[PDB]
RNA sequence: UGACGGAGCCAGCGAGUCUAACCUUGGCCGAGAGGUCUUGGUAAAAACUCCGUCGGGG
């Protein structure tokens, strides 16, 4: 419909408006009628993009926060040659708290373009990594598994790090976008980029996003928006919310 | 359990058990020629083509213990004494062998001369500590005495 | 009494005059725009020996390393190993601020006057 | 050229020598320095060395060639009531 | 219970609590044995009351030391005091006191800090 | 008396229902007050021991 026209005027002004010269990410926001009941945690649920990959993982600075011993977490992923040219720097959580503290979290925010941590110590993160990261979802810390094996009740944790399968996760997590569920209706997803691709690529990125978010089946990662979407609004991080899908 | 192998500017210590590279010595300007352990096994020589020899402790590339400045000609062989454990004997392309006590690493204790051309291998004799065998590069296998004045073979 | 063997002085790699005395994993660090750990990646991609000097490693493959250097996008190498008058007005527009404040206050009028 | 004496061998001592033809030939002074065994490598050999007499382990023959090759040839080597039972 | 005896050691802000009981001849500090003292150059300063006395006098006694406070140099000096006090308090209670007297003499002929710790008190002139 | 990371472990004085930012892009609700969510920018134990990798200023 007019979604191509709305993206056309947004692309035209963002290289022309002096205020919008710096924001390079494109967001669609979703306001629903009912409020989805799950409050805002800090684990970002990711969604796939079935046709067009967003980013390949060899153009983003990737910081990994691992467990406290961190010997074979560092050793295996650096000397496997599946992930050797992938990770930028690996830090243990106790060493991250001790080394990077104060105003150095700002330069850690600016220099490193994406942050991901294991499921072990991700909940401990926001009191050592700072409130600058939790201003929206630009550098919200993403999710990776480490072992591809589970822990039952009273079973000893067997430590294993398979680099191929955690490389495939970073392939599966940089190729697409993610949503963070919220208490109120307004949630925003970052679909596409200004110069990575163009308007027909963003248009089917919109369609695959609203297909996954409105899926009445596939509950725990997809069944978040219930009923129907009232509207969707395409925007940059500093532009206005241009309207599409009025009803 | 170790043997030292020389190469282009790098003497690397191997192992008898793992038959692999234990350590590397990469503190050389020109190519290193000889690398002989002492009979105590603690301190190994390194004759360098830039002119000056360097001897330091085994299993430690970090601590360059001694760097004796020989003559400006390259030194082909730097051997330690077999019965004695404190005197270094080096040759050079300068057609003289020198016997340095490592206490005084600045002045040669006995400038063993009389060679014809290019002494490139020398050896000691396990019976007499005063007798030093010296081989030039034109035949004429010199046998030298260091208890004497030491400027002409026996 | 002959032996068959197989070195040079300082070398240039896209206007970078590098000495031939240290090994290439730290010799390439003097090139601008090259990180330290980027050199250990780009050396093993170019199939060389990491503890080996630049006096060796012949010019037919030395030009092969530097063409890996200048076009990093197409050889599947990630690129994240790579890299006023506004102070003049703001102080001068507070110079008149303190000047008129000295005019406003009936005491501050004795600097060098 | 290298020499070893009184190492564990059927002869008393062995004298080896690199030949610059890929050949390292062993000799013994008791048998009038005659040749007993010779290994052959590809390129000419500039450095030959054997492990000394008191290795107490795997002994090594290290031969070094002109073509930047180090050829290493190595000779390798219940219950406590039931004990009171 | 088994025989036991307990002594105390004191450097600048580091205390040591050593308990000496009859046993198999084992030496323990903070759960770890004595061959794992972390300053690594002062490990011969905690073997020091062991080797002045002869290791046969520790062959049948047990030593368990807790240490809290101080740093590294003050902690090691506390352990060597509590071991030396702990050995000499065992021998004055359940073993010969002439053995205690030769044990005490072998320490004070060496150094007085092994037995009692001199408080480095300030002095005004 | 260097740089780079990786381990090792040691303190004492502290604990008022008291503990602690600013600016901005929007959406929904509300008669307003404002509330809720969204987004981006700005500021904010060491020593020591040990293990390896390393050998003039704009």
From Swiss-Prot, chain A:
Cell compartments where the protein resides: Nucleus, Nucleolus
Keywords associated with the record: Nucleus, Ribosome biogenesis, rRNA processing
Example GO biological process: maturation of SSU-rRNA from tricistronic rRNA transcript (SSU-rRNA, 5.8S rRNA, LSU-rRNA)
Main localisation: nucleus
GO-annotated cellular components: 90S preribosome; nucleolus; nucleus; small-subunit processome
Assembly and binders: Component of the 90S pre-ribosomes. Interacts with FAF1.
Function, in words: Involved in rRNA-processing and ribosome biosynthesis.
Note: Present with 3060 molecules/cell in log phase SD medium.
Protein name: Ribosome biogenesis protein UTP30
From Swiss-Prot, chain D:
Purpose of the protein: Involved in nucleolar processing of pre-18S ribosomal RNA. Required for optimal pre-ribosomal RNA transcription by RNA polymerase I together with a subset of U3 proteins required for transcription (t-UTPs).
Repeat positions for WD: 1-37
Natural source organism: Saccharomyces cerevisiae (strain ATCC 204508 / S288c) (Baker's yeast)
Descriptive protein name: U3 small nucleolar RNA-associated protein 15
Span covered, complete protein: 258 to 360 of 513
Location of the protein in the cell: Nucleus, Nucleolus
Note: Present with 358 molecules/cell in log phase SD medium.
Quaternary data: Interacts with snoRNA U3. Interacts with MPP10. Component of the ribosomal small subunit (SSU) processome composed of at least 40 protein subunits and snoRNA U3. In the absence of snoRNA3, forms a complex with other t-UTPs. This complex can associate with pre-18S ribosomal RNAs.
Swiss-Prot record, chain E:
Segment forming the signal sequence: none
Protein localization: Cytoplasm
Gene3D superfamilies xref list: 3.30.230.10
Main location: cytoplasm
Ribosomal protein as UniProt keyword: yes
InterPro entries, alphabetized: Ribosomal_Su5_D2-typ_SF, Ribosomal_uS9, Ribosomal_uS9_CS, Ribsml_uS5_D2-typ_fold_subgr
Cellular component annotations (GO), alphabetically ordered: 90S preribosome; cytosol; cytosolic small ribosomal subunit
UniProt keyword annotation of Cell division present: no
Glycyl lysine isopeptide (Lys-Gly) (interchain with G-Cter in ubiquitin) crosslink site(s): 28, 45, 57
Residue numbers bearing the Phosphoserine modification: 32, 59, 74
Coiled coil regions in record: none
One GO molecular-function entry: structural constituent of ribosome
One GO process term, biological-process aspect: maturation of SSU-rRNA from tricistronic rRNA transcript (SSU-rRNA, 5.8S rRNA, LSU-rRNA)
Modification sites for Phosphothreonine: 68
Keywords associated with the record: Acetylation, Cytoplasm, Isopeptide bond, Phosphoprotein, Ribonucleoprotein, Ribosomal protein, Ubl conjugation
Pfam families xref list: Ribosomal_S9 (PF00380)
Functional summary from the UniProt entry: Component of the ribosome, a large ribonucleoprotein complex responsible for the synthesis of proteins in the cell. The small ribosomal subunit (SSU) binds messenger RNAs (mRNAs) and translates the encoded message by selecting cognate aminoacyl-transfer RNA (tRNA) molecules. The large subunit (LSU) contains the ribosomal catalytic site termed the peptidyl transferase center (PTC), which catalyzes the formation of peptide bonds, thereby polymerizing the amino acids delivered by tRNAs into a polypeptide chain.
Oligomeric form and interacting partners: Component of the small ribosomal subunit (SSU). Mature yeast ribosomes consist of a small (40S) and a large (60S) subunit. The 40S small subunit contains 1 molecule of ribosomal RNA (18S rRNA) and 33 different proteins (encoded by 57 genes). The large 60S subunit contains 3 rRNA molecules (25S, 5.8S and 5S rRNA) and 46 different proteins (encoded by 81 genes).
PANTHER family to which the protein is assigned, alphabetical: RIBOSOMAL PROTEIN S16 (PTHR21569:SF16), RIBOSOMAL PROTEIN S9 (PTHR21569)
Note from the entry: Present with 33800 molecules/cell in log phase SD medium. There are 2 genes for uS9 in yeast.
Family: Belongs to the universal ribosomal protein uS9 family.
NCBIfam families xref list: PRK00474.1
Record's protein name: Small ribosomal subunit protein uS9A
Gene name linked to the record: RPS16A
């Amino acid at each position: 419909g007019l979604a191509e026209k709305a993206l056309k005027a947004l692309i035209l002004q963002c290289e022309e408006n002096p205020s919008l010269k710096n924001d390079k990410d494109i967001h669609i926001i979703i306001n629903t009628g009912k409020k989805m009941g799950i409050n805002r945690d800090n684990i970002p649920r990711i969604i796939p993009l079935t046709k067009y990959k967003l980013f390949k993982p060899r153009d983003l600075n990737i910081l990994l926060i691992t467990k406290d011993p961190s010997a074979l977490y560092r050793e295996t992923l650096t000397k496997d040659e599946h992930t050797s040219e992938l990770f930028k720097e690996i830090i243990s959580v106790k060493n991250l708290r001790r080394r990077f503290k104060g105003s150095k979290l700002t330069q850690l925010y600016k220099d490193f373009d994406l942050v991901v941590a294991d499921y072990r110590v991700h909940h401990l993160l926001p009191e050592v990594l700072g409130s600058r990261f939790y201003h929206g979802s630009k550098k919200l810390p993403y999710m990776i598994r480490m072992s591809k094996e589970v822990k039952l009740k009273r079973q000893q944790m067997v430590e294993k790090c398979d680099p191929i399968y955690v490389r495939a996760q970073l392939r599966s997590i940089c190729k697409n976008t993610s949503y963070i569920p919220n208490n109120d209706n307004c949630l925003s997803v970052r679909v596409g980029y200004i110069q990575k691709h163009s308007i027909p690529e963003i248009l089917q990125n919109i369609q695959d996003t609203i297909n996954f978010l409105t899926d009445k089946s596939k509950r725990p990662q997809g069944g978040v928006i219930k009923g129907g979407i009232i509207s969707i609004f395409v925007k940059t991080s500093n532009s206005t919310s241009l309207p599409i899908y009025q009803f | 359990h170790d043997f030292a192998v020389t190469s282009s500017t790098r003497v690397q210590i191997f192992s008898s058990r793992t038959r692999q590279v234990i350590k590397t010595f990469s503190r050389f300007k020109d190519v290193v020629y000889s690398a002989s352990f002492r009979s105590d096994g603690k301190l190994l020589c390194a004759g360098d083509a830039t002119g000056l020899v360097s001897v330091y402790d085994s299993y430690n590339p970090r601590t360059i213990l001694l760097s004796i400045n020989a003559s400006t000609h390259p030194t082909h062989v730097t051997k330690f004494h077999t019965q004695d454990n404190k005197i270094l004997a080096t040759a050079s392309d300068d057609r003289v062998t020198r016997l340095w006590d490592i206490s005084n690493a600045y002045e040669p204790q006995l400038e063993l001369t009389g060679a014809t051309d290019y002494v490139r291998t020398l050896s000691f004799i396990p019976a007499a500590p005063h007798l030093v065998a010296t081989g030039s590069y034109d035949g004429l296998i010199r046998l030298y005495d260091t208890r004497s004045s030491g400027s002409t073979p026996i | 009494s002959l032996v068959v063997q197989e070195f040079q002085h300082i070398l240039r790699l896209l206007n970078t005059n590098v000495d031939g005395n240290i090994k290439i994993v730290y010799a390439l660090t003097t090139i601008k725009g090259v990180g330290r750990r980027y050199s250990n990646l780009v050396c093993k991609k170019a199939d060389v020996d990491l503890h080996k000097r630049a006096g060796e490693l012949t010019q037919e493959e030395l030009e092969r390393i530097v063409q890996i250097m200048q076009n990093p996008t197409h050889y599947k190498i990630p690129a994240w190993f790579l890299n006023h008058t506004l102070a003049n007005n703001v102080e001068s527009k507070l110079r008149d601020d303190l000047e008129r404040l000295k005019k406003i206050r009936x005491x501050x009028x004795x600097x060098x006057x | 050229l290298d020499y070893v004496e009184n190492f564990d061998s059927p002869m008393q001592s062995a004298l080896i020598a690199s030949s610059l033809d890929g050949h390292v030939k062993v000799f013994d002074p008791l048998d009038n320095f005659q040749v007993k065994f010779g290994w052959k490598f590809s390129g000419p050999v500039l450095s030959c060395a054997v492990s000394p007499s008191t290795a107490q382990g795997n002994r090594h023959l290290v031969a070094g060639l002109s073509s930047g090759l180090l050829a290493i040839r190595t000779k390798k080597k219940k219950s406590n009531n039931f004990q009171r039972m | 219970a088994v025989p036991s005896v307990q002594t105390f050691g004191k450097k600048k802000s580091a205390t040591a609590v050593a308990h000496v009981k009859a046993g198999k001849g084992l030496i323990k500090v903070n759960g770890s044995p004595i061959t794992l003292v972390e300053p690594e150059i002062l490990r011969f300063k905690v073997y020091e009351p062991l080797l002045l006395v002869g290791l046969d006098k520790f062959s049948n006694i047990d030593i368990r030391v807790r240490v809290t406070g101080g740093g590294h140099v003050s902690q090691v000096y506390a352990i060597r005091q509590a071991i030396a006090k702990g050995l000499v308090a065992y021998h004055q209670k359940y073993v010969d006191e002439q053995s205690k007297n030769e044990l005490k003499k072998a320490f004070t002929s060496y150094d007085r800090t092994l037995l009692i710790a001199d408080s480095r008190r300030p002095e005004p002139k």
